[PDB]
Design a protein around this ligand. Sequence first.
Ligand SMILES: NC(=O)c1ccc[n+]([C@@H]2O[C@H](COP(=O)([O-])OP(=O)(O)OC[C@H]3O[C@@H](n4cnc5c(N)ncnc54)[C@H](O)[C@@H]3O)[C@@H](O)[C@H]2O)c1
Ligand SMILES: NC(=O)c1ccc[n+]([C@@H]2O[C@H](COP(=O)([O-])OP(=O)(O)OC[C@H]3O[C@@H](n4cnc5c(N)ncnc54)[C@H](O)[C@@H]3O)[C@@H](O)[C@H]2O)c1
Ligand SMILES: [Mg+2]
Ligand SMILES: [Mg+2]
Lengths: 387, 387
Amino acid sequence: IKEKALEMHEKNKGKVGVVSKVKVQNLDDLSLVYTPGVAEPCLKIKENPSDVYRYTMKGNMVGVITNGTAVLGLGNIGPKASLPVMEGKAILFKELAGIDSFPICIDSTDSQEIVNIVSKISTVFGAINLEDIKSPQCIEIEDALKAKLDIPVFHDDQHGTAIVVAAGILNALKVVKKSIEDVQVVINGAGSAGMAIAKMLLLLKVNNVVLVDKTGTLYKGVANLNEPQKKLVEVTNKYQEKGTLKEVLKGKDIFIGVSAPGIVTAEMVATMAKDAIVFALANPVPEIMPDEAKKGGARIVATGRSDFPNQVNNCLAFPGVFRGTLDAKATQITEEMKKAATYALKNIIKEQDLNENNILPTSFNKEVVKQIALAVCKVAKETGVVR
Amino acid sequence: IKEKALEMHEKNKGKVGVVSKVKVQNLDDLSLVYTPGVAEPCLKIKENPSDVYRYTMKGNMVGVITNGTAVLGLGNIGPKASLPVMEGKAILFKELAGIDSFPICIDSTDSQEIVNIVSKISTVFGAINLEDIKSPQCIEIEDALKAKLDIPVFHDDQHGTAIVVAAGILNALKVVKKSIEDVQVVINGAGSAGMAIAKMLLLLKVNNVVLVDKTGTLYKGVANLNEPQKKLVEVTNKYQEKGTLKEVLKGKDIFIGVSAPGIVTAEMVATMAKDAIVFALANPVPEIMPDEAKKGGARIVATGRSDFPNQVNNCLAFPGVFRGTLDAKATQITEEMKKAATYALKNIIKEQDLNENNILPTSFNKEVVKQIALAVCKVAKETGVVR
Ligand SMILES: NC(=O)c1ccc[n+]([C@@H]2O[C@H](COP(=O)([O-])OP(=O)(O)OC[C@H]3O[C@@H](n4cnc5c(N)ncnc54)[C@H](O)[C@@H]3O)[C@@H](O)[C@H]2O)c1
Ligand SMILES: NC(=O)c1ccc[n+]([C@@H]2O[C@H](COP(=O)([O-])OP(=O)(O)OC[C@H]3O[C@@H](n4cnc5c(N)ncnc54)[C@H](O)[C@@H]3O)[C@@H](O)[C@H]2O)c1
Ligand SMILES: [Mg+2]
Ligand SMILES: [Mg+2]
């Protein structure tokens, strides 16, 4: 309900407050939380610069940095209007994985300016969560900061998406008894989230993925790919298929839509392979209803909806992703760490309890952050990507 | 004690944590602190951009922004090493004036870069507290951001200093029965804090102030003034005196030192006017001890020391300054608002209870933030500098 939301925000002027982690009411402790006390850790950090991580909030602090240019489904609406979302993201870090988070909203659509600016304010952050930025812009920024900064940088709306998606896919294949190295996938929308699902599947040795945009699939020599679309045309659609979604969906095991509402029909689901897997994650109106999906013959349907039986939820991955990432002092959130965050999530469900309505856990299950963290941590230490 | 400080910081990995201002454990409230709830204030702010201030932390949030280039008496030691100080400053905003504060430490010594960068991250802050930056650099940045941003910007180490100083001066004059429009002041150190005390006194119609640096006083045609020193040479030292501190101190009513340790003697205090006022605020070793100050003949001595009878303390002004500033929705922290913050502070002491050891209140007295706020607020509304 609208009014219920608005009231909530108005109620306390925001969701995000700061507390003191130590106590101070007099002059004694004052000279320790401030001068001349504060001088002593400052000189420590000056001597050994890594000592930031023991006299400071840094190592439990994740920055939630944004642009405003892609806010939920509201798109480019600016830094002010995105603020409530960023505040909301911060307190979820806090409530789900006991993480201190703070929102920074940046007023610039220039990649290089945003890169530089975030890189210059990294002192206080133990990790960066990038949120609600425009594809393709979000990629170069993520990539630029990732090779620039010595702390973990992570675009949740694309990499966090793929973790839950790949989790739900792996679980769904066990159901219909198929293996992901044998199956032909179609992803509608070559934007941020489409892009990254493609990556996380190729990361999983998918047999073949085809990306489709609002104009047709993407193949070598397509008119106008953005720079990341181009790099992805190389790895995807091996058999070099061309044409519209209607034509291309024909014969596929998995449809994954992150694009639009109601662009897929029941007829279209009938053309897909037996035991079809349909993921209609467009929001709020998915590209097809599970009703019309099961009518076409879909064995499994996931959506981005809470009311519907199989919810792809972003709060499944990011709290546990950052938890182990921080818990490990990881300098980086690598691909293998993503890969490990997927399996851990897919394994909350026992394998004895898998259904066509039990491919993903509940988004609040405390055992999700715990296991995703342990696996994200376990590989960080192993691989070396650790302070 | 050192170890006691270091332990304190280590104890909890920093002084600054974040809380949620609203509750959320399930899915119900989740869809209000996040999607689809957060959409509703976001669209409000998009429609009326001022609505930031009712669905968001902004209007109770002050940013503590720094460089590292002037940390206490540690000077240029970088963004990492300054972090504990900035964290300490944030929780004092919180504990003294119930204000949410967050530390941003900037890794750049380029004025224009720092201006731009802070201006670009202003979305989340209701006010800016600039902290621990190099004179003269701090001035152009303060000035640039002050004319650029629509929120209050405030360099505490200079303007906050002057408020307490001017407060202690006005109170001290009542003691020795002198008026500030008749008296001849000398300030040692034409750095940030010296500079700004000069301003706040000229703001008070001082008869004559003389600034002195590590090389001699400042007069028209002095070899190498920085740009702000130059502007101040015009308003100060009317009688155009030249020479060293020894020579120049001779005959003055007030000495105010913000420079060095032990550069003033008892002999030198004997040359000043009757009922001398001596302010040795250099830290930790003041430019003269009260013992040697009263030996020279000082009627009144203030220092920056807690053990000594008259402490100039920065935590006297800034919590109450920002309180009323925020309490008023001030768009600006103007000169008249500074002026009003001074008088309010000087008037915590009854005027029936003034001593040579009672010119300033206690730095924890809750009635200080309250009154400084009401006066800072009262003039904001009057003058118009208000949303
Ligand atoms: N957990 C989840 O449920 C979850 C996570 C991420 C995204 N999503 C949903 O997926 C959708 C995409 O989100 P995003 O972050 O990738 O946004 P995005 O704008 O980056 O992706 C959209 C892309 O799809 C393409 N597209 C648009 N309309 C199309 C059409 N009719 N046919 C084919 N292609 C089309 C466009 O090229 C665009 O670049 C959103 O509606 C969002 O709600 C859901
Ligand atoms: N509330 C307080 O007690 C309070 C507040 C602010 C500053 N201070 C003290 O005052 C001092 C100055 O602080 P600041 O922020 O202005 O630092 P600053 O470096 O900006 O000011 C120092 C300036 O004094 C000049 N100087 C240095 N040594 C000198 C000497 N021997 N003779 C004459 N001039 C000299 C230099 O030109 C320099 O620019 C510090 O030691 C600080 O502890 C105290
Ligand atoms: Mg988002
Ligand atoms: Mg300071």
